[PDB]
Amino acid sequence: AQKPLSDDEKFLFVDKNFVNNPLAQADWSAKKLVWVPSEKHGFEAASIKEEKGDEVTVELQENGKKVTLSKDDIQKMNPPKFSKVEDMAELTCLNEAS
């Protein structure tokens, strides 16, 4: 995006030059990726396995932990595309996790 930064500039502007990769864009196929409540991370990414409407057996794609969790808990994921940007605007999912 812009001129990359010095030691001083690096603290002025965010490192605007973000990047793009096939793996996170191939992984999109797991559209049931949702963010899930956590003490330690705030939130992490898990996936919807069996939709009980208001519950879903969600399963973590970290520990593999099947946690039947509610639709209202499960906070629809935000891909790295908007990472740590210049304004607090550009994040598509304006959400708690993000």
Curated annotation (Swiss-Prot):
Signal peptide: none annotated. It is found in: Cytoplasm, Myofibril. Residues 29-79 form the Myosin N-terminal SH3-like domain. Muscle myosin is a hexameric protein that consists of 2 heavy chain subunits (MHC), 2 alkali light chain subunits (MLC) and 2 regulatory light chain subunits (MLC-2). Belongs to the TRAFAC class myosin-kinesin ATPase superfamily. Myosin family. The rodlike tail sequence is highly repetitive, showing cycles of a 28-residue repeat pattern composed of 4 heptapeptides, characteristic for alpha-helical coiled coils. Limited proteolysis of myosin heavy chain produces 1 light meromyosin (LMM) and 1 heavy meromyosin (HMM). HMM can be further cleaved into 2 globular subfragments (S1) and 1 rod-shaped subfragment (S2). Muscle contraction. This is Myosin-11. It comes from Gallus gallus. The gene is MYH11.
